[PDB]
Amino acid sequence: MRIDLAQAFNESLNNVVSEDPYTKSRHEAGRVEYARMLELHEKIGYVEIPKIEVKLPVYAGTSETVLQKGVGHLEGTSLPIGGSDTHTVLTAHTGLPKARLFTDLTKVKIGDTFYIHNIVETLAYEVDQIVVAEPTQFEELLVKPGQDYATLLTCTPYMVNTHRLLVRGHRIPYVAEEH
């Protein structure tokens, strides 16, 4: 995952997009990078949730290759590199016998902290909203302009899976002098 390209990509989603020829070519290039990551189920990094003791590898896309061995990045959402005008969504199974994965996401509270570890940095998010939505309801996963969110997403209730659990955090400062 080239960072300049992940950024190009992330800029290409958000509300106001420029009609300029240089910008169009940059957005395209970003799109070609994400497709290549998708083609290769490429590892992006890790998500860690300390209070449920989760630390899982994150991969590009939500293919079953990915979802069988770790966490998947929802195609259509920002790459997990942070920044204003970003909203990344990381997804995993609940109630898969093979691995626990996101099963204990139901135990996450508002005020709790999760981290996304990429090749550049640890990013810290503080849970500010938990929503149980229908599988085709996307209104809470969208890019909120000028802002920086990450949602962890899973099937719900346990082994029923009629709904999705949307656990959302806003970006907070990460002081390594602590975590």
Q: How far apart are CA 92 and CA 155, in angstroms?
A: 8
Query: What are the DSSP calls for 97-166, one per residue?
Result: SS--TTGGGGG--TT-EEEEE-SS-EEEEEEEEEEEE-TT--TTSS--TT-EEEEEEEEESTTT-SEEEE
Q: Please, which experimental method was used?
A: X-ray
Q: How far apart are CA 43 and CA 39, in angstroms?
A: 11
Task: Specify the residue for token string 């630390």.
Answer: 55
CATH number at residue 130: 2.40.260.10
Nearest to 75 by CA among 25, 103, 41: 41
Distances (CA, A) of 26 to 42, 94, 118, 128: 21, 37, 22, 33
Query: Would you state the structure tokens that stand for residue 147, as one six-digit string?
Result: 């802002």
Q: How far apart are CA 87 and CA 145, in angstroms?
A: 9
Give the resolution value in Å. Answer: 2.4
**What residues make up the domain containing 96?**
1-179
DSSP reduced 3-state for 50: helix
* HSE, side-chain direction, 13 A CA sphere, residue 164: 20
Q: How many domains does the chain have?
A: 1
